[PDB]
Design a protein around this motif. Structure first.
Motif, PDB file in Angstrom:
ATOM      1  N   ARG A  15       0.840  -1.193   0.000  1.00 31.91           N
ATOM      2  CA  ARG A  15       0.000   0.000   0.000  1.00 31.91           C
ATOM      3  C   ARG A  15       0.878   1.247   0.000  1.00 31.91           C
ATOM      4  NH1 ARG A  15      -2.177   3.866   2.838  1.00 31.91           N
ATOM      5  NH2 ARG A  15      -1.705   3.510   5.053  1.00 31.91           N
ATOM      6  N   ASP A  16       0.749   2.103  -1.008  1.00 30.24           N
ATOM      7  CA  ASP A  16       1.554   3.318  -0.992  1.00 30.24           C
ATOM      8  C   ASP A  16       0.578   4.494  -1.077  1.00 30.24           C
ATOM      9  OD1 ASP A  16       0.988   3.836  -3.758  1.00 30.24           O
ATOM     10  OD2 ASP A  16       2.837   2.890  -4.436  1.00 30.24           O
ATOM     11  N   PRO A  17       1.027   5.753  -1.096  1.00 28.15           N
ATOM     12  CA  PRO A  17       0.058   6.863  -1.046  1.00 28.15           C
ATOM     13  C   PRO A  17      -0.891   6.926  -2.237  1.00 28.15           C
ATOM     14  CG  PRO A  17       2.278   7.653  -1.551  1.00 28.15           C
ATOM     15  CD  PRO A  17       2.413   6.257  -1.048  1.00 28.15           C
ATOM     16  N   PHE A  18      -0.659   6.157  -3.304  1.00 21.88           N
ATOM     17  CA  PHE A  18      -1.468   6.261  -4.513  1.00 21.88           C
ATOM     18  C   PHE A  18      -2.080   4.938  -4.971  1.00 21.88           C
ATOM     19  CE2 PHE A  18       1.711   9.647  -4.659  1.00 21.88           C
ATOM     20  CZ  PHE A  18       0.897  10.749  -4.793  1.00 21.88           C
ATOM     21  N   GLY A  19      -1.984   3.867  -4.180  1.00 21.49           N
ATOM     22  CA  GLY A  19      -2.423   2.567  -4.654  1.00 21.49           C
ATOM     23  C   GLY A  19      -2.695   1.599  -3.528  1.00 21.49           C
ATOM     24  N   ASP A  20      -3.589   0.656  -3.792  1.00 24.00           N
ATOM     25  CA  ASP A  20      -3.991  -0.333  -2.815  1.00 24.00           C
ATOM     26  C   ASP A  20      -2.973  -1.462  -2.726  1.00 24.00           C
ATOM     27  OD1 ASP A  20      -6.302   1.082  -2.235  1.00 24.00           O
ATOM     28  OD2 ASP A  20      -7.429   0.043  -3.814  1.00 24.00           O
ATOM     29  N   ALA A  21      -3.150  -2.306  -1.708  1.00 20.91           N
ATOM     30  CA  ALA A  21      -2.218  -3.402  -1.464  1.00 20.91           C
ATOM     31  C   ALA A  21      -2.170  -4.355  -2.652  1.00 20.91           C
ATOM     32  CB  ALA A  21      -2.619  -4.165  -0.195  1.00 20.91           C
TER      33      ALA A  21
ATOM     34  N   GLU B 136       8.886  13.049   6.068  1.00 22.19           N
ATOM     35  CA  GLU B 136       7.984  11.987   5.603  1.00 22.19           C
ATOM     36  C   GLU B 136       7.711  10.988   6.728  1.00 22.19           C
ATOM     37  OE1 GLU B 136       9.078   8.901   2.935  1.00 22.19           O
ATOM     38  OE2 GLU B 136       7.293   9.081   1.685  1.00 22.19           O
ATOM     39  N   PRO B 137       6.477  10.914   7.249  1.00 22.20           N
ATOM     40  CA  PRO B 137       5.261  11.504   6.682  1.00 22.20           C
ATOM     41  C   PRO B 137       4.991  12.970   7.070  1.00 22.20           C
ATOM     42  CG  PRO B 137       4.665  10.188   8.575  1.00 22.20           C
ATOM     43  CD  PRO B 137       6.183  10.108   8.456  1.00 22.20           C
ATOM     44  N   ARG B 138       5.706  13.534   8.037  1.00 25.60           N
ATOM     45  CA  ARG B 138       5.577  14.967   8.328  1.00 25.60           C
ATOM     46  C   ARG B 138       6.439  15.812   7.390  1.00 25.60           C
ATOM     47  NH1 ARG B 138       2.960  16.015  13.118  1.00 25.60           N
ATOM     48  NH2 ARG B 138       2.199  17.690  11.736  1.00 25.60           N
ATOM     49  N   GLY B 139       6.014  17.069   7.189  1.00 31.50           N
ATOM     50  CA  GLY B 139       6.781  17.990   6.360  1.00 31.50           C
ATOM     51  C   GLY B 139       8.230  18.119   6.791  1.00 31.50           C
ATOM     52  N   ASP B 140       8.466  18.242   8.106  1.00 37.79           N
ATOM     53  CA  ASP B 140       9.784  18.146   8.716  1.00 37.79           C
ATOM     54  C   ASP B 140       9.642  17.361  10.008  1.00 37.79           C
ATOM     55  OD1 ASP B 140      11.794  19.918   7.164  1.00 37.79           O
ATOM     56  OD2 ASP B 140      10.120  21.313   7.528  1.00 37.79           O
TER      57      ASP B 140
ATOM     58  N   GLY C  88      18.953   8.799  -3.878  1.00 38.74           N
ATOM     59  CA  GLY C  88      18.931  10.247  -3.812  1.00 38.74           C
ATOM     60  C   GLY C  88      17.859  10.861  -2.924  1.00 38.74           C
ATOM     61  N   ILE C  89      17.667  12.161  -3.136  1.00 41.90           N
ATOM     62  CA  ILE C  89      16.792  12.976  -2.301  1.00 41.90           C
ATOM     63  C   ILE C  89      15.391  12.886  -2.900  1.00 41.90           C
ATOM     64  CG2 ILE C  89      16.338  15.264  -1.361  1.00 41.90           C
ATOM     65  CD1 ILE C  89      19.294  15.898  -1.643  1.00 41.90           C
ATOM     66  N   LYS C  90      14.520  12.097  -2.269  1.00 39.63           N
ATOM     67  CA  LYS C  90      13.132  11.871  -2.696  1.00 39.63           C
ATOM     68  C   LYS C  90      12.424  11.119  -1.568  1.00 39.63           C
ATOM     69  CE  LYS C  90      13.868   9.672  -6.566  1.00 39.63           C
ATOM     70  NZ  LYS C  90      15.259   9.555  -7.084  1.00 39.63           N
ATOM     71  N   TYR C  91      11.221  10.622  -1.851  1.00 37.08           N
ATOM     72  CA  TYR C  91      10.472   9.838  -0.873  1.00 37.08           C
ATOM     73  C   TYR C  91      11.327   8.675  -0.364  1.00 37.08           C
ATOM     74  CZ  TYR C  91       9.756   6.235  -4.412  1.00 37.08           C
ATOM     75  OH  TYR C  91       9.956   5.249  -5.350  1.00 37.08           O
ATOM     76  N   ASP C  92      10.991   8.185   0.833  1.00 34.89           N
ATOM     77  CA  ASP C  92      11.735   7.100   1.482  1.00 34.89           C
ATOM     78  C   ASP C  92      11.495   5.792   0.724  1.00 34.89           C
ATOM     79  OD1 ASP C  92      13.278   5.795   3.507  1.00 34.89           O
ATOM     80  OD2 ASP C  92      11.493   5.485   4.722  1.00 34.89           O
TER      81      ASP C  92
ATOM     82  N   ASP D 202      15.839  -2.872   6.978  1.00 37.11           N
ATOM     83  CA  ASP D 202      14.561  -2.176   6.968  1.00 37.11           C
ATOM     84  C   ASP D 202      14.283  -1.826   5.507  1.00 37.11           C
ATOM     85  OD1 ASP D 202      12.241  -0.902   7.473  1.00 37.11           O
ATOM     86  OD2 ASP D 202      13.153   0.836   8.460  1.00 37.11           O
ATOM     87  N   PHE D 203      13.635  -2.744   4.794  1.00 34.35           N
ATOM     88  CA  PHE D 203      13.410  -2.585   3.365  1.00 34.35           C
ATOM     89  C   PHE D 203      11.979  -2.999   3.040  1.00 34.35           C
ATOM     90  CE2 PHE D 203      13.275  -6.618   0.842  1.00 34.35           C
ATOM     91  CZ  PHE D 203      13.192  -7.491   1.927  1.00 34.35           C
ATOM     92  N   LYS D 204      11.507  -2.565   1.874  1.00 36.64           N
ATOM     93  CA  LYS D 204      10.205  -2.971   1.355  1.00 36.64           C
ATOM     94  C   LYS D 204      10.415  -3.659   0.018  1.00 36.64           C
ATOM     95  CE  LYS D 204       7.376   0.715   3.392  1.00 36.64           C
ATOM     96  NZ  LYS D 204       6.637   1.977   3.086  1.00 36.64           N
ATOM     97  N   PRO D 205      10.054  -4.928  -0.151  1.00 36.18           N
ATOM     98  CA  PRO D 205       9.987  -5.493  -1.509  1.00 36.18           C
ATOM     99  C   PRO D 205       9.001  -4.692  -2.340  1.00 36.18           C
ATOM    100  CG  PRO D 205       9.669  -7.194   0.189  1.00 36.18           C
ATOM    101  CD  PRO D 205       9.527  -5.853   0.868  1.00 36.18           C
TER     102      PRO D 205
END
Ligand SMILES: OC[C@H]1O[C@H](O)[C@H](O)[C@@H](O)[C@@H]1O
Ligand SMILES: [Co+2]
Ligand SMILES: [Mg+2]
Length: 387
Positions: free
Chosen positions: A22-28, A185-189, A250-254, A286-289
């Motif tokens: 599950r990510d911010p734009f899609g279901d599991a 992420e998930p807070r702005g800072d 790089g510098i982007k979402y986790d 600490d990873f996500k497939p």
């Protein structure tokens, strides 16, 4: 080749292989995993142990009777396989009640609840044999400038960690705390956004000896920082209690890619540092497939985490053992870096005309550091274009 065994101290969070996608734009994209199946599958892969949030193991809101049945099943799987539980943590970020944080929520009643929820899981973690209790304050922060008085928030954060330290010492528990930084992420800072900020904060707690850091490869890279440098500073301070290994581009979402993916040369220098310093804690992934993968890809991705550590470990050992690399290190004066600058003392340095009055600044400036030849040897060893 590169077969992991329990001696290698590889561990995984239940939430890693068990991420449903599950990510911010899609279901599991995957069904939920039974923690018992994860323990047995990871044992078969060669893992040393598993870690968990309270809510990974016991569904939120569970009655005291449901909670006992969840814990019993899990312990039986651990007993059957010999798997260890070296670390545990609290979920203070998923439930809507924590939307403004746990320890630093503006609402006082939420902060008290956060502390009681945490203490309950410390008891369980100690029962199961955990040595390290991680805190990741993923909701402690803000999206806007006026929402959080950061000095007051740091007072509340210090208060919470001081109370946890009073609790474990009053109980005679043999467990230490590790703060895990993340910049956003998930807070702005997020408060305590890097390893440095966390290290500085620990020094203001009442019992600093009980607290260290759990740095994450990807998190420091989300600030564009050098992760091996930050690990070196944590080791230098005696505060590297635990570590999260993964990859990040790089510098982007986790991203939480499998270890070895992302910045490959950073991973090599990281493994070189951990092994040459004799780090003895868990090598925790600490990873996500990725959510593109089915359950076969989940276990392939988990296996790849361990494989890439073992390959990099072999290449870093070959690098340090090479007499040509040792010669290049002397050529770059890495050995002079180890010598004290002024062990003769301040007055001797002040009276030394060779240190200023008669220092030949032009001859010193003309010496090459020979760093590029050393770095190409490191590249050749990483790529196995030499041994
Ligand atoms: O602190 C325990 C873990 O909690 C969450 O799953 C975070 O995403 C992860 O970064 C952290 O390591
Ligand atoms: Co992460
Ligand atoms: Mg982490």
């Amino acid at each position: 080749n590169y077969q992991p065994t329990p001696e290698d101290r590889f561990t995984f969070g239940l939430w890693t292989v068990g991420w449903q996608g599950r990510d911010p734009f899609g279901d599991a994209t995957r069904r939920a995993l039974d923690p018992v199946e994860s323990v047995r599958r990871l044992a078969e892969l060669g893992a040393h142990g598993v870690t968990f949030h309270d809510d990974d193991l016991i569904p939120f809101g569970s009655s005291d009777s449901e909670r006992e049945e969840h814990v019993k099943r899990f312990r039986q799987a651990l007993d059957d396989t010999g798997m260890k539980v070296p670390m545990a943590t609290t979920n203070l970020f998923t439930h809507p009640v924590f939307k403004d944080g746990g320890f630093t929520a503006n609402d006082r009643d939420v902060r008290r609840y956060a502390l009681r929820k945490t203490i309950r899981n410390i008891d369980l973690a100690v029962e199961l044999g955990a040595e390290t209790y991680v805190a990741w304050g993923g909701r402690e922060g803000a999206e806007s400038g006026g929402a959080k008085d950061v000095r007051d928030a740091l007072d509340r954060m210090k208060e919470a960690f001081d109370l946890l330290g009073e609790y474990v010492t009053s109980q005679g528990y043999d467990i230490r705390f590790a703060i895990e930084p993340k910049p956003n992420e998930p807070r702005g800072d997020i408060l305590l956004p890097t390893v440095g900020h966390a290290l500085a904060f620990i020094e203001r707690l009442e019992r600093p000896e009980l607290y260290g850091v759990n740095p994450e490869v990807g998190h420091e890279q989300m600030a564009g920082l050098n992760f091996p440098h930050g690990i070196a500073q944590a080791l230098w301070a005696g505060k590297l209690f635990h570590i999260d290994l993964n990859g990040q581009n790089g510098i982007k979402y986790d991203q939480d890619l499998r270890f070895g993916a992302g910045d490959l040369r950073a991973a090599f220098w990281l493994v070189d540092l951990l092994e040459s310093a004799g780090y003895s804690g868990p090598r925790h992934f600490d990873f996500k497939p990725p959510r593109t993968e089915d359950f076969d890809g989940v276990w392939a991705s988990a296996a790849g985490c361990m494989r890439n550590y073992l390959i990099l470990k072999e290449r870093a050992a070959a690098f340090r053992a090479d007499p040509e690399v040792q010669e290049a290190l002397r050529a770059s004066r890495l050995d002079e870096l180890a010598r004290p600058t002024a062990a003769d003392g301040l007055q001797a340095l002040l009276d030394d005309r060779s240190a200023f009055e008669e220092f030949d600044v032009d001859a010193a400036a003309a010496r090459g550091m020979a760093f590029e030849r050393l770095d190409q040897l490191a590249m050749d060893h990483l790529l196995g274009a030499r041994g």
